[PDB]
C-alpha cells in the first residue's frame, strides 16, 4: 500500500543494532525498529565515500 | 583491571551484600559484545539476585 525509505549512517559494529526488537546507543536513541517489523535493512561499508 | 588471568585458569570473583547499576555498565558503549541469557539486559537494573 506504501513504502518508506529510511536512510542513515552508523558504524559496521552498529548494523546489527538495526533489527527488529534491537537495545543499544543507535537502538535506543536513534532509530528503533518495532517488534513486529515487515521490512528489509540494507546496508554497506561506505569508507569510500 | 591492569592484568586479565589466563583463560586456562579463568578468575573468578564474588559479588555480594552490594547495590549494584547495570545501567553503568550497559550504557557504558565499551564494549564489543554484550550478550545476556535468561536476562534481559535493560531489566537487569530492576532485578535482586
Given at each position: 500500500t506504501n513504502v518508506?525509505?529510511?536512510?542513515?549512517?552508523?558504524?559496521?559494529?552498529?548494523?546489527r543494532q538495526i533489527?527488529?526488537?534491537?537495545?543499544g546507543?543507535?537502538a535506543?536513541?536513534?532509530?528503533?525498529?518495532?517488534?513486529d517489523?515487515t521490512?528489509?535493512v540494507?546496508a554497506?561499508?561506505?569508507?569510500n565515500? | 583491571?591492569t592484568?586479565?588471568?589466563s583463560?586456562?585458569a579463568?578468575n573468578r570473583?564474588?559479588?555480594?551484600?552490594?547495590?549494584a547499576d547495570?545501567?553503568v555498565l550497559?550504557?557504558?558503549?565499551s564494549?564489543?559484545?554484550?550478550?545476556?541469557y535468561?536476562?534481559?539486559?535493560t531489566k537487569?537494573?530492576d532485578?535482586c539476585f
Open positions: 518508506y525509505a529510511d536512510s542513515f549512517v552508523i558504524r559496521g559494529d552498529e548494523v533489527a527488529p526488537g534491537q537495545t546507543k543507535i535506543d536513541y536513534n532509530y528503533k525498529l518495532p517488534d517489523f521490512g528489509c540494507i554497506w561499508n561506505s569508507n565515500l | 583491571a592484568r586479565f588471568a583463560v586456562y579463568w570473583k564474588r559479588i555480594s551484600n552490594c547495590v547495570y545501567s550497559y550504557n557504558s558503549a564494549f564489543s559484545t554484550f550478550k545476556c535468561g536476562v534481559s539486559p537487569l537494573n532485578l
